[PDB]
Design a binder for this molecule. Sequence first.
Ligand SMILES: *[C@@H]1O[C@H](CO)[C@@H](O[C@@H]2O[C@H](CO)[C@@H](O[C@@H]3O[C@H](CO[C@H]4O[C@H](CO[C@H]5O[C@H](CO)[C@@H](O)[C@H](O)[C@@H]5O)[C@@H](O)[C@H](O[C@H]5O[C@H](CO)[C@@H](O)[C@H](O)[C@@H]5O)[C@@H]4O)[C@@H](O)[C@H](O[C@H]4O[C@H](CO)[C@@H](O)[C@H](O)[C@@H]4O[C@H]4O[C@H](CO)[C@@H](O)[C@H](O)[C@@H]4O[C@H]4O[C@H](CO)[C@@H](O)[C@H](O)[C@@H]4O)[C@@H]3O)[C@H](O)[C@H]2NC(C)=O)[C@H](O)[C@H]1NC(C)=O
Ligand SMILES: *[C@@H]1O[C@H](CO)[C@@H](O[C@@H]2O[C@H](CO)[C@@H](O[C@@H]3O[C@H](CO[C@H]4O[C@H](CO[C@H]5O[C@H](CO)[C@@H](O)[C@H](O)[C@@H]5O)[C@@H](O)[C@H](O[C@H]5O[C@H](CO)[C@@H](O)[C@H](O)[C@@H]5O)[C@@H]4O)[C@@H](O)[C@H](O[C@H]4O[C@H](CO)[C@@H](O)[C@H](O)[C@@H]4O[C@H]4O[C@H](CO)[C@@H](O)[C@H](O)[C@@H]4O[C@H]4O[C@H](CO)[C@@H](O)[C@H](O)[C@@H]4O)[C@@H]3O)[C@H](O)[C@H]2NC(C)=O)[C@H](O)[C@H]1NC(C)=O
Ligand SMILES: *[C@@H]1O[C@H](CO)[C@@H](O[C@@H]2O[C@H](CO)[C@@H](O[C@@H]3O[C@H](CO[C@H]4O[C@H](CO[C@H]5O[C@H](CO)[C@@H](O)[C@H](O)[C@@H]5O)[C@@H](O)[C@H](O[C@H]5O[C@H](CO)[C@@H](O)[C@H](O)[C@@H]5O)[C@@H]4O)[C@@H](O)[C@H](O[C@H]4O[C@H](CO)[C@@H](O)[C@H](O)[C@@H]4O[C@H]4O[C@H](CO)[C@@H](O)[C@H](O)[C@@H]4O[C@H]4O[C@H](CO)[C@@H](O)[C@H](O)[C@@H]4O)[C@@H]3O)[C@H](O)[C@H]2NC(C)=O)[C@H](O)[C@H]1NC(C)=O
Ligand SMILES: *[C@@H]1O[C@H](CO)[C@@H](O[C@@H]2O[C@H](CO)[C@@H](O[C@@H]3O[C@H](CO[C@H]4O[C@H](CO[C@H]5O[C@H](CO)[C@@H](O)[C@H](O)[C@@H]5O)[C@@H](O)[C@H](O[C@H]5O[C@H](CO)[C@@H](O)[C@H](O)[C@@H]5O)[C@@H]4O)[C@@H](O)[C@H](O[C@H]4O[C@H](CO)[C@@H](O)[C@H](O)[C@@H]4O[C@H]4O[C@H](CO)[C@@H](O)[C@H](O)[C@@H]4O[C@H]4O[C@H](CO)[C@@H](O)[C@H](O)[C@@H]4O)[C@@H]3O)[C@H](O)[C@H]2NC(C)=O)[C@H](O)[C@H]1NC(C)=O
Ligand SMILES: CCC(CC)O[C@@H]1C=C(C(=O)O)C[C@H](N)[C@H]1NC(C)=O
Ligand SMILES: CCC(CC)O[C@@H]1C=C(C(=O)O)C[C@H](N)[C@H]1NC(C)=O
Ligand SMILES: CCC(CC)O[C@@H]1C=C(C(=O)O)C[C@H](N)[C@H]1NC(C)=O
Ligand SMILES: [Ca+2]
Ligand SMILES: [Ca+2]
Ligand SMILES: [Ca+2]
Ligand SMILES: [Ca+2]
Lengths: 388, 388, 388, 388
Amino acid sequence: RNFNNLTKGLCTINSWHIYGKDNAVRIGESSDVLVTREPYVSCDPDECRFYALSQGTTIRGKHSNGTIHDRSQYRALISWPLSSPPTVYNSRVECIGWSSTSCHDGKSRMSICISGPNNNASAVVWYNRRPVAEINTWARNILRTQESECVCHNGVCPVVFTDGSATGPADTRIYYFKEGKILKWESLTGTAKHIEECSCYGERTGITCTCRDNWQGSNRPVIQIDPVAMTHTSQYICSPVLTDNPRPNDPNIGKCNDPYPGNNNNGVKGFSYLDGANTWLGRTISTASRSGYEMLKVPNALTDDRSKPIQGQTIVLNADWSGYSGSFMDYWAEGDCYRACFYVELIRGRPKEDKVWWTSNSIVSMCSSTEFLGQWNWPDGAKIEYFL
Amino acid sequence: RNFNNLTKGLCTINSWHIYGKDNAVRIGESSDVLVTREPYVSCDPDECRFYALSQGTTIRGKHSNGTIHDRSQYRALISWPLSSPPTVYNSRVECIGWSSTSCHDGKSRMSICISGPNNNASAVVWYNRRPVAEINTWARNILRTQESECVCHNGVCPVVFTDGSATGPADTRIYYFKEGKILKWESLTGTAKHIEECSCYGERTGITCTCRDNWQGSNRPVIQIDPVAMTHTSQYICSPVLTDNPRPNDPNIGKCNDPYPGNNNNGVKGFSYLDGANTWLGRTISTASRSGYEMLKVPNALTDDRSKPIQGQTIVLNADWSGYSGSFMDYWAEGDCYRACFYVELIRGRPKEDKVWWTSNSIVSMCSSTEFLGQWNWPDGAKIEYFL
Amino acid sequence: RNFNNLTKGLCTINSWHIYGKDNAVRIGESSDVLVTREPYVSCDPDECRFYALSQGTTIRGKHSNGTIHDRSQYRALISWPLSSPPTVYNSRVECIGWSSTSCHDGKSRMSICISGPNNNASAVVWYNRRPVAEINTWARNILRTQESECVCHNGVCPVVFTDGSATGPADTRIYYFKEGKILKWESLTGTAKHIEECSCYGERTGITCTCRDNWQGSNRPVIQIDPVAMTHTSQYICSPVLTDNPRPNDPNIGKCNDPYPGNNNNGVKGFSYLDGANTWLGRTISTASRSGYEMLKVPNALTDDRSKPIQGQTIVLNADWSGYSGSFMDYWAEGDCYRACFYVELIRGRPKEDKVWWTSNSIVSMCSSTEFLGQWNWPDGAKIEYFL
Amino acid sequence: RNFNNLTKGLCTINSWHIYGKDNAVRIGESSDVLVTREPYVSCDPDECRFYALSQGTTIRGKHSNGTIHDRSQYRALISWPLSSPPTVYNSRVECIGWSSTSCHDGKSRMSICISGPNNNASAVVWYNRRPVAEINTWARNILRTQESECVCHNGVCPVVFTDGSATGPADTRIYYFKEGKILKWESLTGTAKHIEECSCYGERTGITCTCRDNWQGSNRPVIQIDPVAMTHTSQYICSPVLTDNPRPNDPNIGKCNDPYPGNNNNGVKGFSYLDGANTWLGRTISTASRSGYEMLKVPNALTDDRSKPIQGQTIVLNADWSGYSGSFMDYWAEGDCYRACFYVELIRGRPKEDKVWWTSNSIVSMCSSTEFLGQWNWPDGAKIEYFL
Ligand SMILES: *[C@@H]1O[C@H](CO)[C@@H](O[C@@H]2O[C@H](CO)[C@@H](O[C@@H]3O[C@H](CO[C@H]4O[C@H](CO[C@H]5O[C@H](CO)[C@@H](O)[C@H](O)[C@@H]5O)[C@@H](O)[C@H](O[C@H]5O[C@H](CO)[C@@H](O)[C@H](O)[C@@H]5O)[C@@H]4O)[C@@H](O)[C@H](O[C@H]4O[C@H](CO)[C@@H](O)[C@H](O)[C@@H]4O[C@H]4O[C@H](CO)[C@@H](O)[C@H](O)[C@@H]4O[C@H]4O[C@H](CO)[C@@H](O)[C@H](O)[C@@H]4O)[C@@H]3O)[C@H](O)[C@H]2NC(C)=O)[C@H](O)[C@H]1NC(C)=O
Ligand SMILES: *[C@@H]1O[C@H](CO)[C@@H](O[C@@H]2O[C@H](CO)[C@@H](O[C@@H]3O[C@H](CO[C@H]4O[C@H](CO[C@H]5O[C@H](CO)[C@@H](O)[C@H](O)[C@@H]5O)[C@@H](O)[C@H](O[C@H]5O[C@H](CO)[C@@H](O)[C@H](O)[C@@H]5O)[C@@H]4O)[C@@H](O)[C@H](O[C@H]4O[C@H](CO)[C@@H](O)[C@H](O)[C@@H]4O[C@H]4O[C@H](CO)[C@@H](O)[C@H](O)[C@@H]4O[C@H]4O[C@H](CO)[C@@H](O)[C@H](O)[C@@H]4O)[C@@H]3O)[C@H](O)[C@H]2NC(C)=O)[C@H](O)[C@H]1NC(C)=O
Ligand SMILES: *[C@@H]1O[C@H](CO)[C@@H](O[C@@H]2O[C@H](CO)[C@@H](O[C@@H]3O[C@H](CO[C@H]4O[C@H](CO[C@H]5O[C@H](CO)[C@@H](O)[C@H](O)[C@@H]5O)[C@@H](O)[C@H](O[C@H]5O[C@H](CO)[C@@H](O)[C@H](O)[C@@H]5O)[C@@H]4O)[C@@H](O)[C@H](O[C@H]4O[C@H](CO)[C@@H](O)[C@H](O)[C@@H]4O[C@H]4O[C@H](CO)[C@@H](O)[C@H](O)[C@@H]4O[C@H]4O[C@H](CO)[C@@H](O)[C@H](O)[C@@H]4O)[C@@H]3O)[C@H](O)[C@H]2NC(C)=O)[C@H](O)[C@H]1NC(C)=O
Ligand SMILES: *[C@@H]1O[C@H](CO)[C@@H](O[C@@H]2O[C@H](CO)[C@@H](O[C@@H]3O[C@H](CO[C@H]4O[C@H](CO[C@H]5O[C@H](CO)[C@@H](O)[C@H](O)[C@@H]5O)[C@@H](O)[C@H](O[C@H]5O[C@H](CO)[C@@H](O)[C@H](O)[C@@H]5O)[C@@H]4O)[C@@H](O)[C@H](O[C@H]4O[C@H](CO)[C@@H](O)[C@H](O)[C@@H]4O[C@H]4O[C@H](CO)[C@@H](O)[C@H](O)[C@@H]4O[C@H]4O[C@H](CO)[C@@H](O)[C@H](O)[C@@H]4O)[C@@H]3O)[C@H](O)[C@H]2NC(C)=O)[C@H](O)[C@H]1NC(C)=O
Ligand SMILES: CCC(CC)O[C@@H]1C=C(C(=O)O)C[C@H](N)[C@H]1NC(C)=O
Ligand SMILES: CCC(CC)O[C@@H]1C=C(C(=O)O)C[C@H](N)[C@H]1NC(C)=O
Ligand SMILES: CCC(CC)O[C@@H]1C=C(C(=O)O)C[C@H](N)[C@H]1NC(C)=O
Ligand SMILES: [Ca+2]
Ligand SMILES: [Ca+2]
Ligand SMILES: [Ca+2]
Ligand SMILES: [Ca+2]
């Protein structure tokens, strides 16, 4: 087997087709389905799987009580077959912790999980299902990482980490791993002022990450990584089509090098594909809460501070709960281009649905089509009253 | 591995032997068994599996309430090991949607699922577990396909699709795929006046599909496909042994080129093996409802409008519920001939059993024997009262 | 891969060690464990598995009600990993039916299941997980077979079948299969007067089967099969140590060529290893019912009508329920000899425990040791009151 | 494949990172999780798995009542995927019995299970999933072994056994196996006065086992084994940092060649890594009961009767229940050194929590880091009240 190289461009995105959906909460009403949050999708050369942070209990289990909590000793990164739900009997534990990323380099998979108390957290880097390297907290304030897949080129897999305040200046680092070993790390440079939960994808130009400014900005920070030189730059998406949540209404001029103001100390993990005229942005439909999800085609969104949508597709209706979203691609698929994909976390339970005492989610995922396909909407589909 | 070629004739059919049965509803009374409908069977070169459309809930789950509904966002084509039931923990999702077909070409499996609202549905074609091609609705009225396996020759896999009215003239197309890519499609030609849910099988002469005229006819439409030239013809089974349900009583003269009248705007998916003197037809025993199932040997049924049975075999008693039926064969079996097989969907719950709020099914399947074997009958076997 | 040849003798049997035990009824009190009966054990070249006839329901399921019944459309031969219980999610269906045998020939596994009504039953012979040959009833009275593994030599696998009365003269046949095809069959010859449920094992001398005379005899019939010439002989175990159940007390002179009288129209499946001075017989401890199990070393039991035990080992206490027993060996194990093994079916529920409405079992199995090992006893271990 | 050779030293231990945790009791509150005790961890060349002694029932099952009991016919050594819980559907039975060890030699795995009544117990040695050799009790008083993994060098796998009194002089033997065959055994020599439940690890110097003196000593006995010459020596850990439980308070002078007095007729399975200045000892935090767990760096603990800690790490808070602990390493990992690992059994239920009628456990495991990582604490995490 050989290391995968990023040698293709993105396929032209004219619409999005359904890729996967696990209906986990519906099924977990009467099955041994693990409580999760922070899901994602990641491909091996022979298989694509769903990933998430388990809470170490099933939904019907009494220990689901209190699972709105983020960081406990009972969490772990699990993976399971595409569009199956995460069950006790089919979920594979990748590592123990409450913040994670994972990616295949063409030869083997690297998985990273962070665990610990707020002031003493540490990352363990697994490669080919064995622990290889460990990284101690550098700011002693919740060391944390992407919550979606990383991307590799010629064996080098960059990962974005943050340690420090979630509502002020923090210490973000980009690490470059190979076979789980640390080749290099560097402090964040560029004009992004705060970085959380980067969603990344790779193509021939390099690796692109769209992140979450949890401090002052409702536009999204972008980090662009050269995996060969192992260097990066950062800025914001220039477009006035703002894609964080909550957020102000869309103005007519965006901000390329500073946070767009109006909403502070909150946000949601999200993603974009930035590819000139082939640029598509994801966002919640609501500006106030994690409900709805849409994709909008916004030409040159990265660089054009006047850019507006010329096409779009509704993924989840505003009436339905959404949540985290992130990017992934099947780098091992046949063809001359990489087909853009994404997932949306469909959060059920607390805080928005507090008649139950748990918080969990299901997953919906889509990939791009060169056809102009009809659109549906894709809700979680569970009836909360059934759990009372 | 090589593409499979259709190089054999059908084995002589002198009776039918039990092949598989999953007892899904019996088991699902007290196990995590997925609610399904529209099942079928399809073989890989190394394994044969059951397939069906899950409803994204177990039978005992509260979300089974309302599963008489056909098209929701919570459906998916799943597959699972022969004669096991479709459980949450053993079912593999092939793709997301509410109408499907699937077949192995000798090298890899193609699966097609259609999803969307009635006026904006789209098919995604998967090959070797990856999405490859997409087809948007052409008539904007429930794009839909076979609900049983397709058949391949030298890598070419024809599939029958319909889009448009289910009770009037519609737009039927035959698509020819190879490795999931569209080689060609063509509009339906011939004398069949309406096409739904084709059940197909292949042999050296070509591919034969027996379908459902949901409009005016109670005889079944037949499409005969040449997978090399990628062309087809269509007509009806000429025999006065009528095999749709509901249906008029058997007359003494059938219709080769037009619907046999008496019952409109309904029908059921079914199948036949049309092979001269080796011809066998399947049908429900009842002329009014989906109950019972029998196989009847009717020589030259395809071409002889006077043909009557000379032999038969009861599969399911008239006292027991049946449902959809379709054809499949193990093209990779040893020997000088292809052994004809079929499945019968045994529907339980609504609309016929409305004391429960769900609709599901189990599966029974048979293959042909050159012996004259004794016959049994094969009911679903669940006691509905247990679910109250 | 090559066909296995029977080239070794039996290992010297000085005691028996625990081999496997699934505790199925204990576990099935609170797990999705299938109701079964008629279990056995059979080895592949790379794995050994438990086998049994499922009743198509779990024990806690309401459909377990009435499972004392022998022959329904909901039964199937299943196999599952050694010492695991037969669960809905781990059991592999081998074929559909209510009487079975199975064995590996070194290259692939043959499995045979019989299904049908009493007067029209038929066997389907599966080889390498595909149906290959079918055999219709010849006496129209419950065609039936071994209920434990068959044995193969150089690809030839003999199987004993009976069709006809269970309480009078019947039509027993020995079939010789290769790759699932019928090479030959022959009517029973020799002095055995009635044959049921043969337990067989192979070694360099040939294949030895110990069966159940359900008509007049409480000594066990023996069939000795030459798998090369494809011929056989039959007689009874000469020893006055009688091993059927129920049975008279042990006399001082046995019967080699006729049934030992006293008990009619009943019996139980059992086994023996007949190997000169290395001869061991299994039997229930009770002479009246299926309770207890012991192994007794009885030199030349096959040929010596005065032979008595010189050593023994208790397997299950008389206070605990037993049931069917049969032989198997791991023909693919390392060494210069074949290690004798057996299983005992531990029946729980009806008819003996009628406070529950079901009948099921667990399995215990042992293999021989050349050491003189201490003995334990091995009960099913479930508390029936827990199921009320 | 080749036999593994112990050719490396231990990696430098500067802290411990989380390796695995199954949260079994939390999950088993509402899932089919087997009741267990005496767990451990052991690696194959391609996978690492959790191991334990099942009680042949799930926790929610009524048969969990009375599982404080040590030795029944319903126990078996099971293994299951790393950090998954031991479920009915994912647990693989290695052998039947109530005391065990297991290890991979580089080619195949050897597993040993002991079963029987107190006065007639016997060990069966499995190699490559087949029984190979058997060992009868020599002292007729609960033949018993390590309860954690053994270690192999060039195919030779030493195992420590004890037979006889648990509260007085007993007959301890060291057996040397290869491919499951007994190469040699020898009676215990050296100054250790009583040996139970040895935890072992291997490196280039040889095999080191830290055991439990259940008779008079609260310091731990050590057996050092040369797997090439197949000889051993024994003594105690000289350090006054006492590591058995219960135990006296730490004095300032330890005992190298006799039990340190104060606590009699009790103890707990534990472990240490004895490696000069790289020496780390594990122990419960409490001196009275199995609660808490800590690792302490104690230079030359084996040989220095004045040695005290210079570094440490809390694993489980004193407020939380612990239990057995033992050593294992991934001998097949990449690198120039063996990374020390261990597990801690987290016992829940009886005797300490008697509002429930069962006794079970979950597992936490750690490996060493050359970094100085922040520490967390790792409780079982189940709420006992949920089970009432
Ligand atoms: C079957 O399926 C198919 C396939 O899905 C369905 O077809 C799809 O239909 C949907 C729904 O209509 C479309 O999505 C919308 O797309 C438009 C963009 O396309 C329009 O505008 C284009 C650009 O026009 C501008 O430039 C051109 C020059 O290039 C110039 O000529 C023009 O005058 C103008 O200057 C047009 O090019 C385009 O026309 C083309 O396409 C037409 C079909 O759509 C076709 O008919 C034409 O002939 C031509 O070919 C078209 O006019 C998006 O603008 C829109 O997204 C906005 O609206 C939705 C609500 O619906 C909202 O959620 C979005 O967030 C967004 O609106 C917010 O953001 C804006 C930007 O900041 C802002 O300006 C808005 O005020 C609004 O802001 C508010 O809400 C947000 C979100 O909550 C909040 O954050 C803000 O603060 C604020 O509160 C949709 O994405 C698909 O594109 C279309 N697909 C295809 C292939 O056709 C079909 O309908 C289905 N059939 C059936 C029967 O159902
Ligand atoms: C153990 O197992 C074995 C193996 O399964 C069992 O043996 C089987 O038994 C079953 C049940 O009897 C048989 O199925 C029936 O087969 C007959 C056809 O065979 C008969 O007719 C043949 C043709 O005769 C015609 O042509 C010949 C010239 O070739 C001429 O000589 C003759 O006079 C006539 O002109 C005969 O050749 C054949 O004889 C042969 O076989 C005999 C054994 O069967 C043997 O004894 C003979 O010696 C000779 O070898 C035999 O006479 C089918 O006609 C029949 O199917 C009809 O009836 C069932 C109800 O039972 C119904 O459900 C079917 O739909 C069908 O009847 C409907 O359709 C007809 C056609 O339109 C119509 O005319 C009817 O009025 C009826 O229509 C009504 O109902 C339908 C359905 O609801 C509705 O849609 C309509 O609108 C309307 O309301 C059976 O399939 C097996 O063939 C047989 N198998 C074997 C190998 O023998 C055995 O019984 C078991 N043993 C025990 C102890 O149980
Ligand atoms: C730790 O574990 C070890 C290993 O398991 C335990 O040791 C085992 O202990 C058990 C239980 O005692 C033994 O099983 C019994 O074996 C005897 C046979 O061995 C005895 O007899 C031998 C033959 O003697 C005859 O020939 C010799 C010449 O060769 C001659 O010298 C002699 O006088 C006589 O003529 C002796 O050779 C043998 O001695 C040897 O072994 C001794 C140890 O056992 C040793 O001490 C000696 O020094 C010497 O080495 C020994 O005396 C079986 O006969 C017996 O089976 C019968 O009894 C049980 C009930 O216990 C019953 O269930 C059986 O069915 C059977 O009895 C029925 O059938 C008989 C035959 O028809 C009939 O005659 C009986 O009347 C009876 O029939 C009634 O019941 C049946 C069944 O319900 C019914 O069908 C009938 O109709 C009727 O109602 C046991 O199998 C093991 O052999 C022994 N193993 C070893 C390796 O030692 C040890 O105990 C454990 N330790 C502890 C502390 O627990
Ligand atoms: C983020 O995470 C990091 C990483 O985990 C955290 O840092 C860790 O913090 C923990 C907790 O403090 C430390 O564990 C303790 O380690 C000490 C040993 O280190 C101390 O002592 C060393 C030796 O000093 C001696 O020799 C030197 C010469 O070499 C001489 O100079 C000195 O004067 C003295 O003679 C020092 O070298 C060492 O200093 C170094 O490290 C310091 C950081 O720790 C640093 O600040 C210094 O600059 C320098 O670099 C340090 O002083 C252990 O002694 C201790 O274990 C004892 O105490 C715990 C309770 O806390 C107890 O459970 C243990 O069992 C043990 O105490 C029992 O046993 C003793 C031995 O018999 C006995 O003497 C005690 O009385 C006691 O006995 C009683 O209890 C037991 C158990 O119940 C019972 O059996 C008895 O009968 C009796 O009842 C801890 O293990 C880590 O080492 C440290 N790790 C690192 C890398 O720094 C950090 O805190 C986290 N951050 C935050 C914000 O939370
Ligand atoms: C601690 C900062 C971080 C980013 C803003 O908070 C998160 C936001 C959450 C959210 O906004 O839904 C859920 C996360 N699991 C969480 N990460 C951790 C490690 O707890
Ligand atoms: C929409 C037309 C179509 C064919 C008549 O209806 C079907 C008949 C059904 C039936 O007659 O049982 C069930 C089907 N799942 C269905 N197909 C879809 C896509 O909903
Ligand atoms: C029909 C005769 C046969 C042998 C005596 O009866 C059996 C005895 C039984 C028994 O004695 O327990 C159970 C069997 N499952 C059964 N076989 C069939 C095919 O029903
Ligand atoms: Ca923000
Ligand atoms: Ca019709
Ligand atoms: Ca009898
Ligand atoms: Ca002690």
